[PDB]
Design a protein around this ligand. Structure first.
Ligand code: NA
Length: 57
């Protein structure tokens, strides 16, 4: 499942992904923590909040 980034988000720690409007995050998985997803961008995996992105269907 891929997601499209709809709002910029900036990582505040290493395990988070910095993401930018229009980029596709690939292979997104849900986390135990509510409000957070994990996925791959540009060869790197990290988490980010789910309100910045939209599931591509
Ligand atoms: Na690259």
């Amino acid at each position: 499942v891929d997601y499209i980034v709809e709002y910029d988000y900036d990582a505040v720690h290493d395990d988070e992904l910095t993401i930018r409007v229009g980029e596709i995050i690939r292979n997104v998985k849900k986390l135990q923590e509510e409000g957070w997803l994990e996925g791959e961008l540009n060869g790197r995996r990290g988490m980010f909040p789910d309100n910045f992105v939209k599931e591509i269907k």
